[PDB]
From Swiss-Prot:
SUPFAM superfamilies linked to this entry: Lysozyme-like (SSF53955)
Protein name per its UniProtKB record: Endolysin
pH dependence: Optimum pH is 7.3.
Stated family: Belongs to the glycosyl hydrolase 24 family.
GO molecular function (one): lysozyme activity
Lineage: Viruses, Duplodnaviria, Heunggongvirae, Uroviricota, Caudoviricetes
Recorded consequence of changing G30A: Almost complete loss of enzymatic activity
Coiled coil: none
Organism listed in the record: Enterobacteria phage T4
Major enzyme class: hydrolase
Length: 164
């Protein structure tokens, strides 16, 4: 298991524009297009991202390309974030993947807001962090996925994902 496989399980793969869990236009492997209510706006963002007139449909390779770029960006966002970097640097390889997953889903800014959980992770207080992480909109809105990431932080193993 690795970050790629992990997020592919969490986000799935769709080759046509769809609405994510928050009702926003998305494509591929969780690549958000826009928060705008307009499908045209989404098709426009899509063609600009791909570099061709897609008509709202992309291929598998194109999806994988956006995915590689998004993962890369998530990592770089962590590394450039003064609040995130220290945490990421303190963790082991498995737990680092759990932090990348959260950043990919909710953005650098959203994750940097879990101040108390971040401190606990930094301190290696696993069970405490898991409890603190669960008290969030994130967990109440997407509980099955939140539980998988949380278990990851708690145990430092990929067990929540083995089977998927
Ligand atoms: Cl893009
Ligand atoms: Cl979920």
């Amino acid at each position: 298991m690795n970050i790629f496989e992990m997020l592919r399980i969490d986000e799935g793969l769709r080759l046509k524009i769809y609405k994510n869990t928050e009702g926003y236009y998305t494509i591929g492997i969780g690549h958000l297009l826009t928060k705008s209510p307009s499908l045209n706006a989404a098709k426009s963002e899509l063609d600009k991202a791909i570099g061709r007139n897609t008509n709202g449909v992309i291929t598998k390779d194109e999806a994988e390309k956006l995915f590689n770029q998004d993962v890369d960006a998530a990592v770089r966002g962590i590394l450039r974030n003064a609040k995130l970097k220290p945490v990421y640097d303190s963790l082991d390889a498995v737990r680092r993947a759990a932090l990348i997953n959260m950043v990919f889903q909710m953005g650098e800014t959203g994750v940097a807001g879990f101040t108390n959980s971040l401190r606990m992770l930094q301190q290696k207080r696993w069970d405490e962090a898991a409890v603190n992480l669960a008290k969030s909109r994130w967990y109440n809105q997407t509980p099955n996925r939140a539980k998988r990431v949380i278990t990851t932080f708690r145990t430092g193993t990929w067990d929540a994902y083995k089977n998927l």
